[PDB]
Write a structure and sequence with these properties.
This is part of a larger assembly, with six copies of chain A, one copy of chain B (162 residues) and one copy of chain C (284 residues). Chain A is mostly helical and 172 residues long. Helix content of chain A is 60%, strand content 0%. Chain A has nine helices and no strands. Chain A is flat and about 60 Å long. Chain A starts with a helix and ends with a helix. The chains are: A mainly alpha (172), B mainly alpha (162), C mainly alpha (284). Bound molecules: phycocyanobilin (13 copies). The PDB classes it as photosynthesis.
Chain lengths: 172, 162, 284, 172, 172, 172, 173, 172
């Protein structure tokens, strides 16, 4: 588990020097940009259950044999299996935006996930068609103009979508 | 990596046969030949600090503009002169490495591999380093057959420079 | 590999005669030459009529072009580039080109270092030439010899780490090279630079257990601890796919369990209760 | 590649004894029934191209999304490609009836076929619905009473259908 | 290899409908802004070799153990190795701006690069400190105006920097 | 491929210092003890074919089912298979004594050999019973008191048997 | 996993997603009709279960006599009790296969990882399947003998009782 | 492969002078007429398959022994052989009009073609009776008055027919 605050410590320990002033001016922007990050996470987790089924209205409608008899999402515990861990993508992507660095994402969704997904027999590439459909709905909710004072969240929007692209790369 | 003991192995391995007397003849040369090569290693290691600052101030003589022109590549300020004794001091390491190995392998793998790529990008003219190595081969003070021994590998780095 | 040929699926390639274009051609042999070049160079991908390379088959009938200079024309075509080159990683290309043309796995790291330096300064045009204008190609394939699978055989000193990797390149007779279950990513880039050689999983289907490739964080291959067994008699176990409550109880399948000799009777009954199948059992 | 003649050698080599007389009386019945087997293969191969499209008149009509836009038999090389693979079932089942033992069938259609069929994304279970439709047409052709002197090849016929059932089991 | 023109075909094929008029008005803006990109792209490739060493004037000066004895950029072919493929980042980022979509970028620099970079032993995080230093120099050249008619180039530039951020995310 | 001469370079490159004088006094003993090593190798390769069958008079006599019908050394190609690579142990052990370091031994006989020996079905432990029988005959020949001037072969001899023990450890 | 004749004709019928046809139910009606014979027959194997194993061990060791002679892997006494500990486990799962009527419960226990341990331990794998055939020669001799039992053809069961032993010998050798 | 643009470079390199102003006024004329060249090529390639059979309605009707038993166009792969390379004449003549110079034509259809056509046994003169019949149909299509702005195409047409006359001279 690493951070933005702790990773700029950990490489600074490996070189064994004191922290420079332009690293502290970098972290001062992280504290300054910190409030926005909290707001983004709050909206994702409050619409967390609404994202997953709305991704499941397209993850299964686009590849309709998966549900149909024979596919690996066919029976009912198999169907509840790809809602049990469609949300675990959201459970750890929201941990990554909170920490601000994807080093907590790559131990849980990216570490051994591509190994089980050929051991089980599930289509690995049929996950990353719908994690992209989560990202299309996650940054849409995140960018909402209602109930929040206007501010620039562009850094979060593009590197929020970078966490989904890392979440799709190690499965496909 | 290239060594007369290694060159006996990789020749006999690609044929799939044992070590014949022709690979085993060759091992003998390093043993007989090396005895004079390790004489050349101690001659350069003991005179190492005299030879580096003897070289990096000899290149400033023939190329006086290298201490004057303001450029990252050029050794104008102290940071270039700090990277001067690093680079020329890297050469005497690999020359002493290829002495005790008997082959040109460590010279072939550490120093001259991809040297035309790096000198074009950083605009380091290879006429600088060949001027330092001519100072080393004339001022190491080595004598006898060991004086021949360091003189091949220095001159082998010269031809790979140009 | 007489006994293991059936498990390997290497039974077709074991006693398969090389195709061997004659100095005087005839039409029945020329089309049979082009078929076996199309299977091995393109990894058995189906070739339709528009993909048939009708002009380069035209040159072959005359006899002006030998087999080896035909294989360069199919490798330099966009057809072979559309299937492999435009999606695959560049280390994934190197294990393909060694498999397609020389017929073996990249055994050493230096071959991947050297081939990337060539592609960069001169181009993939000049990179296909470096396989064909090589001594490993000319020694085992003449000018009129169709390339085949030389991987299974001893091959005059090829590293036995190379022998494992060939089974990791292709999975059997019915596979192709765009159709394996790892897709675009490279298969022998991790095992080549780490210099560890993973399990020869047999090909599918006749083997009950196929879904085990070398995981990211696997436990070490040789243990050093006693592993809580009165004596040192430890055997490594590799399970494919473990079914259980999959989020809480078995968070990661296809992992090794390092059990010593005393409980190995008990351990195999524990694995089979979940339903995972054993791949390999290696002592330590 | 094994046979009926060669497999009763290969286990007899593993035990290292001479061939018994009741094994030779078994093989004498295999020679006696040899004429019937040849006739069956000829009938199948002469109606080989007529079987495949008549199976494709039901393989696609029963699961009609497959050729509809989105299915894996949709575009034209995908349609043609599937057909080419489908016959290869008939190319090796006819090799199995000729050899008389399914050991040449399990290296080509049964060995790695279930691995590619989750790597590509094709429905594996949607093959074995139509290989059964081949078997319904293959043993119907074999059964014909016209142009052939009558004999009882019912035993030969049942284990023709066993080769199709092995061809459907390792894909589904 | 996908495009802006071809990707709006490829999802439109998956739904199987004709292209809508507002997709063609979208592509008409892509043609309209097309001339600027060629101009923008040409400036990167003409200053392509000048970027790499000027990034190497900081990639190694900031983490100075890397070229000091022991680091993985120490010896001379090792040093020429991280100029051999510092430019391959620029070789494929310029392909991404030409195509207008990062789908050609993610097969070459983002696909298996994070796997080799723990197999070799190179610091993976020490790449993305300097790919950011490339982006600081790339958008400085692409924006600077000398002898060129002036039009807003804000849209092209922001998503030029998005390709570098995707190039840094899958290595770190 | 490493050596005694090249491995004391390769760790000395990783620390980046000049070679010390006590490392050169170490290598001076290697040159001094160098002549003895060549003599030992010559006697092994001249009795190379005589060792293998004399090991095969006990490798098969001690475990006699291996040859007997059913064992993996039964048929004739199978028998010539464990003479085609019984000598490859001697082909690379003699390369290890020539180089003086086992780093050329561990890429060919020790790297993937334990993986093929469970893929093929051969007994892996039944190799290392007879590689020990090679070592009992190899150091018996390399120790000879006839036709050679007396000298100390104690250091050269013990670590010849260490290469066989490494050759038996990675197979068993 | 554990499948049947009744459950496997469900499991492929689920994968195609159709109702069960009438000729599949006429097939299963013969399975119920031929079902009684299997139970009576299978009771004869388990009642002579311990008598089979040693009578196979009078020939498994007499034919390859170095195995119990000093040096063989059946030499010492716990090693000898090890190949009676799991000679019967072949019979423990073959009798489960005849009960279920399908070999899908046989291939998870005796056929799954058995050929992997048998080169990890050092035991001769081929020296097992010489004696599992000697079990089959004694198993179908007991199951066919008609003693104090009404006589009906038992041919279908016997041929495919011996098919389970041949599957039990193929994945070890 | 040469051009109009590159051949006026290549002789200008051999004399080693700068390009004169009347050579640039010559190349300026080509640019002005550049649109016409593109238009002619497009029409030919869109009617490319319609030309070949309509030439084959006269190439074989005029010399009718060729497809009659005995002629070299008799059997069916022999017949498909003189349609597989009747179009290769059109494949390289259209390359010549695109490049604007016949230097790409003379390496493929004119280089060794007259040598194979006496090695095979085909009538060489019976090709150039029908390549003239292609030219009679090619310049009839390239000269249409419908759907194209009207300008004289004679400068282009006469030297389109010069490429066919070069294509007939080196075969006959
Ligand atoms: C639609 C794009 C958009 C976003 C995302 C946005 C967020 C946003 N959240 C803000 C404030 C804030 N946001 C939070 C949120 C929280 N603090 C906590 O400790 C809680 C856990 C969490 C709520 C659950 C807080 C506490 C503030 C303080 C300032 C305020 O009251 O607005 C502000 C005030 C202005 C600024 O930060 O520059 C912005 C811009 N504004 C925008 O225009
Ligand atoms: C172990 C063998 C070895 C050597 C010798 C070596 C040299 C080497 N010197 C370099 C730069 C340099 N080399 C010099 C040296 C000189 N420039 C001058 O002006 C003087 C004429 C001359 C010294 C006498 C300087 C000043 C730089 C920095 C130039 C720059 O940053 O652009 C660089 C590129 C950047 C770097 O990592 O520092 C390499 C790779 N690398 C190696 O791996
Ligand atoms: C109990 C005594 C005994 C031994 C030792 C033995 C060896 C033996 N090794 C074989 C194959 C093999 N042997 C090797 C070993 C090697 N090839 C290489 O490339 C390396 C140089 C070398 C190892 C250092 C390999 C890789 C195969 C598989 C070759 C093939 O399948 O064609 C085969 C034929 C196929 C087989 O069943 O696996 C036998 C019979 N058999 C025996 O009964
Ligand atoms: C009188 C009208 C007439 C024509 C034109 C004709 C052509 C013709 N060309 C043939 C082969 C051929 N045609 C070519 C020509 C070409 N292949 C190439 O690579 C080039 C692209 C192209 C020339 C530009 C070649 C090289 C062969 C020999 C191919 C083989 O032997 O397989 C063949 C089959 C074999 C033969 O008898 O030589 C016929 C029938 N036959 C006819 O009766
Ligand atoms: C936080 C890291 C982490 C992840 C991600 C994880 C996932 C995960 N998903 C599993 C199964 C599964 N996962 C899926 C998922 C899907 N199948 C489809 O067809 C869909 C496209 C897709 C959902 C969108 C399915 C169907 C299974 C059941 C497979 C089986 O029962 O054989 C399993 C094992 C079976 C289980 O217990 O359910 C794991 C470990 N476990 C972890 O520890
Ligand atoms: C003789 C041994 C053998 C077999 C069996 C074989 C099968 C085979 N089928 C393949 C593809 C394929 N196989 C199918 C089959 C189907 N898709 C569907 O949705 C349908 C239900 C079904 C036809 C009824 C398709 C559609 C592809 C192409 C997939 C793609 O291009 O994405 C491939 C991958 C290579 C390629 O497609 O070029 C192989 C190797 N190859 C062999 O050498
Ligand atoms: C509808 C069910 C049915 C079948 C299938 C059938 C086949 C059949 N084929 C027969 C003969 C035969 N069948 C063949 C066929 C061939 N031999 C070759 O070498 C050729 C390759 C091949 C033809 C292409 C031959 C040669 C005979 C010899 C006896 C005869 O003339 O009938 C006979 C004669 C009687 C007997 O064999 O007992 C039978 C029964 N009879 C039936 O009632
Ligand atoms: C076409 C896309 C493509 C890329 C980019 C690529 C990179 C790549 N860089 C490598 C090694 C390397 N990569 C670097 C680069 C670096 N290390 C450092 O110290 C610096 C921080 C950094 C450069 C900024 C170095 C020095 C090596 C050699 C390391 C070794 O040999 O262990 C290797 C493994 C060995 C090799 O063949 O050279 C690959 C595969 N391969 C690809 O196919
Ligand atoms: C492939 C060869 C090729 C190039 C290179 C090319 C570039 C090119 N850029 C143009 C315009 C332009 N290009 C730019 C670009 C920019 N202005 C800024 O201030 C920004 C920083 C920057 C974008 C980041 C602008 C603003 C225009 C104005 C005209 C237009 O919208 O096209 C035009 C319009 C026509 C003309 O200039 O004669 C040309 C020709 N055309 C070609 O045929
Ligand atoms: C590759 C061809 C080749 C061979 C074979 C070779 C052998 C060789 N062994 C030598 C010495 C020797 N060799 C031995 C070896 C032994 N004495 C014992 O009593 C032990 C039992 C045994 C070692 C096990 C001894 C003791 C010497 C003494 C001289 C020395 O230290 O080299 C020498 C020294 C120079 C000479 O004898 O003229 C030679 C030439 N030289 C070659 O160029
Ligand atoms: C339920 C499926 C299953 C099976 C079958 C199984 C077998 C099994 N057999 C073992 C040993 C063994 N098995 C044998 C068997 C034999 N020796 C011979 O010569 C004969 C051919 C054969 C007896 C017929 C021997 C000798 C050992 C011990 C070898 C040793 O430890 O050196 C061990 C080692 C540790 C232990 O037994 O507790 C296991 C786990 N485990 C399982 O989970
Ligand atoms: C030697 C070859 C042979 C066998 C194997 C054989 C068995 C056999 N068992 C039968 C009946 C039966 N067998 C059983 C046996 C049992 N039912 C249970 O629920 C108990 C658990 C189990 C005894 C432990 C029963 C209950 C019947 C009912 C009919 C009868 O009383 O015979 C019958 C009556 C006739 C028929 O089924 O067609 C046959 C044939 N007959 C033969 O000729
Ligand atoms: C029958 C003899 C004949 C020909 C051949 C002919 C062609 C022809 N093409 C023209 C224009 C043109 N032709 C093209 C064609 C194209 N530009 C492209 O970039 C595309 C790739 C390609 C279509 C696929 C274009 C773009 C023009 C521009 C002028 C116009 O719209 O007519 C014009 C306009 C008047 C002129 O050029 O002087 C002529 C003459 N006119 C004739 O009388």
């Amino acid at each position: 588990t690493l951070d933005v605050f702790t990773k700029v410590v950990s490489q600074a320990d490996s070189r064994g020097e004191f922290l420079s002033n332009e690293q502290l001016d970098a972290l001062a922007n992280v504290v300054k940009e910190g409030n926005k990050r909290l707001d983004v996470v709050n909206r994702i987790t409050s619409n967390a259950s609404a994202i997953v089924t709305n991704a499941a209205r397209a993850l299964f409608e686009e590849q309709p044999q998966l549900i149909a008899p024979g596919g690996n999402a066919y029976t009912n515990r198999r169907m509840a299996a790809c809602l049990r861990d469609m949300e675990i993508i959201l459970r750890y992507v929201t941990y990554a935006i909170l920490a601000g660095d994807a080093s907590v994402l790559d131990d849980r969704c990216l570490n051994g996930l591509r190994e089980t997904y050929q051991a089980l027999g599930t289509p690995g590439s049929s996950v990353a068609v719908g994690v992209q459909k989560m990202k299309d709905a996650a940054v849409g909710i995140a960018n909402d103009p209602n109930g929040i004072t206007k501010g620039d969240c562009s850094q979060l929007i593009s590197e929020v979508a970078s966490y989904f692209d890392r979440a799709a790369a190690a499965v496909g | 990596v290239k060594t007369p003991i290694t060159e006996a192995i990789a020749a006999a391995d690609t044929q799939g046969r044992f070590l014949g007397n022709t690979e085993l003849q060759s091992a003998r040369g390093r043993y007989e030949r090396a005895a004079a090569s390790l004489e050349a290693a101690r001659g350069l290691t003991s005179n190492a600090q005299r030879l580096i600052d003897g070289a990096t101030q000899a290149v400033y003589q023939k190329f006086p503009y290298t201490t004057q022109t303001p450029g990252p590549q050029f050794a104008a300020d102290s940071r270039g002169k700090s990277k001067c004794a690093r680079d020329v001091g890297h050469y005497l390491r690999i020359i002493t490495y290829s002495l005790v190995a008997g082959g040109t392998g460590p010279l072939d793998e550490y120093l001259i591999a991809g040297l035309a790529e790096i000198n074009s990008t950083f605009d380091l003219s290879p006429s600088w380093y060949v001027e330092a190595l001519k100072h080393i081969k004339a001022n190491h003070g080595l004598s006898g057959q060991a004086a021949n021994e360091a003189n091949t590998y220095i001159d082998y780095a010269i031809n790979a420079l140009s | 590999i007489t006994t293991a040929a059936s498990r390997l699926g290497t039974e077709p390639f074991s006693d398969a005669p090389k195709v061997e274009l004659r100095p005087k051609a005839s039409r029945e042999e020329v089309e049979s030459v082009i078929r076996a070049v199309y299977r091995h160079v393109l990894g058995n991908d189906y070739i339709l009529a528009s993909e048939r390379l009708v002009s380069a088959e035209s040159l072959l009938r005359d006899g002006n072009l030998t087999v080896r200079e035909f294989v360069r024309s199919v490798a330099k075509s966009e057809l072979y580039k559309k299937k492999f080159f435009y999606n695959s990683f560049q280390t994934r290309l190197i294990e393909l080109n060694y498999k397609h043309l020389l017929g073996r796995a990249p055994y050493d790291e230096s071959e991947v270092v050297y081939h990337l330096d060539l592609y960069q300064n001169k181009g993939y045009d000049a990179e296909i030439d470096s396989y064909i204008d090589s001594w490993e190609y000319q020694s085992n394939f003449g000018d009129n010899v169709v390339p085949y699978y030389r991987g299974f055989e001893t091959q005059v000193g090829q590293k036995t780490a190379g022998f494992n990797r060939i089974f990791r390149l292709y999975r059997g007779y019915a596979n192709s090279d765009r159709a394996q279950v790892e897709g675009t990513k490279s298969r022998l880039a991790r095992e080549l630079a780490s210099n560890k050689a993973s399990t020869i999983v047999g090909p599918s289907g006749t083997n009950d257990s196929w879904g085990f490739r070398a995981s990211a964080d696997v436990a070490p291959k040789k243990n050093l601890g006693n592993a809580v067994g009165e004596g040192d008699r430890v055997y490594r176990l590799e399970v494919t796919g473990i079914r259980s409550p999959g989020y809480p109880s078995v968070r990661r399948s296809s992992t090794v369990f390092i059990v010593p000799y005393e409980r190995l009777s008990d351990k195999i009954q524990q694995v089979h209760k979940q339903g995972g199948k054993i791949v390999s059992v290696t002592s330590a």
